[model samples]
Target: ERPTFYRQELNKTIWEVPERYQNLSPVGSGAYGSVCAAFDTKTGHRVAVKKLSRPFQSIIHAKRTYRELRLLKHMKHENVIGLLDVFTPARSLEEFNDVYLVTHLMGADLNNIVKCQKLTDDHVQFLIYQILRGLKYIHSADIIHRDLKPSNLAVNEDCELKILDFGARHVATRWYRAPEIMLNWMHYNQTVDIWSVGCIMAELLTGRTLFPGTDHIDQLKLILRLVGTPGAELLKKISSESARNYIQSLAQMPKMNFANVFIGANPLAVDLLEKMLVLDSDKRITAAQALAHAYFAQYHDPDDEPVADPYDQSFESRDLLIDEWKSLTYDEVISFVPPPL
Candidate 1:
């Protein structure tokens, strides 16, 4: 039988709790945690509650846990999801192993909406532009979203969009996964995410996954088919001998035009897509440059965008001790959880 998630009240203050937010139903789940939609009675607002999974199962998981929290906490961009409220069922720190992140409930994820094929050209343009805007801030913080699939993107009826879900997973979901990541390139950079944005743009334009491969090998083949096979010069740059050899053996494939893949998409849209999905990470367009493209000239303004503040905290997990992670989670749980505010 499927287990049901329920709500309860906190006796500490006039502020109510999980009970204040009721009628919960699961909305999403992944390597990090599970999310449920809830109704917040105190203010008549609908909210999402995410129950983080195995936050301290290992040093790697703990690092990911902290990284996700730190990234979400510091990100204040209009296109990113801000932490609305946080709560944990446990009252004591020793027992406080789980965390519940709250945020304004979104109507549905882009994956769901994209399936309906209701997005107009303007929607596609703005949605991709907003993603780049959010990414500009993320990349500045020395972070890579690594995972940028449609389901990780949330949207509302008003057409507002936001990026969410940060993970430490070794690979991104196959469809939007980048060539560098697939080939196991050493020292992959933020450009891998731009490649994903390109795939996403193509998907949104065509209303189907750009590269729907059944597996990693198939995924690489699909990419080669559309983007053309990587050259010997490019393969030499790949550090993985086996992967490089595999690429060399594949028949050289000619590049396909962006319009052929995105079919009837705006010329400017196809132009941006071509720039974003480059196989060479160094050649891919940066998020800032993408925003400045003529495709978004109407809505984008450099003056309105603030410079990214340099990060004070290190993103590397090796900087901290493994034993200290428990204290970190406890601190986060107590400090972050609050009455709906």
Candidate 2:
């Protein structure tokens, strides 16, 4: 049975949703929730509405969901997705009431964009910098965005990135999951975010997931294949016998030489990637430290040139580059490969 949270029915005055919002259309969906595009009838503003899934089986799940809501309420940063308003059911009789979170509608996620246009190294760095900036703020608030993948990051019409999705966003993944989390050492913290950033950096360069493993075992195999297996000293720290046995079982897997595999890749990119995917989570670079890396020193802004705003009345004549993916064929996608280093 799913666990339920202690939700109080506040006054009707507090439950009111703005009258402007009308007509909802499906935008996106996932295991946690579904997002819909809604129009504000009064102001003609388009907003995305995210409805949270109900009755979580775990307290950690409920707390993480609430943590995101609380964090957004107090923390305002450009890279992070902003919460405009929230909607709870008006009547208490509904079987499973939902919470509606409203935010500005974004164009497409990074994964979708990358499939069409090849991102320059500078472009990749700029996005990475923005992600780190956002993550830095989240860490400051004592929260961690455990899941930081391309699909979770959206780029608006103005090319601004807004990180979204906070489910399974707990403190770790097997490989990108920090060493501390691997050992179940203390509660996992902000270091998991750094590992995610590193994975994202590699993805930007390759136009694919850095470690697209199938399951927990496969995930570790992929990581070890790239960064090599961790030493006995590191494995000994894992308290769970099952976890320790799992690590021991994989001891015979051959180590990978990342440097040899990424022969032509940028040295700085490789350097940052290595540091982020370190076997020991304690040694991984912090978000602030990553922002100081020289890799981002020469970032170039593609949208710097003056462009008419899509929302402007006079801009109707201009073709908006919102859906670049649909315009390009698979062949075209392959043709737009990253420049050789």
Q: Estimate each model's TM-score.
A: 0.86, 0.70
Residue lDDT tens for model 2, 1-341? 11122232222111224455655666666566666667755456788766665423344444434444544444456677866655454333222234557777785777656665447777777788778777766666556677677777877656678776452321124534543454455645678878778877776777666777676667766777676766787676566787767667775656565676554577887777777877666678887677667776664233421221122123223343322212211112223221111
Q: Each candidate's lDDT (Cα)?
A: 0.75, 0.59
Candidate 2: residue pairs that collide: none
TM-score of candidate 2 relative to the true fold: 0.70
Top-lDDT candidate index: 1
Count of backbone clashes for each model?
0, 0
Instruction: Compare the candidates by TM-score and give the number of the best one.
Output: 1
lDDT of 1 by residue, 1-341 (tens): 11233444221112224566787766656677777778978788898877777777888877777776766666677777767776666667666566677778886877766676636789998888889888888788777888888777888877778888552221138888887887767687999889889888887878777888999999899999898988667776787889877788786888997677678878999999889888889789999999999999887988865546676565463556654775676676566634334
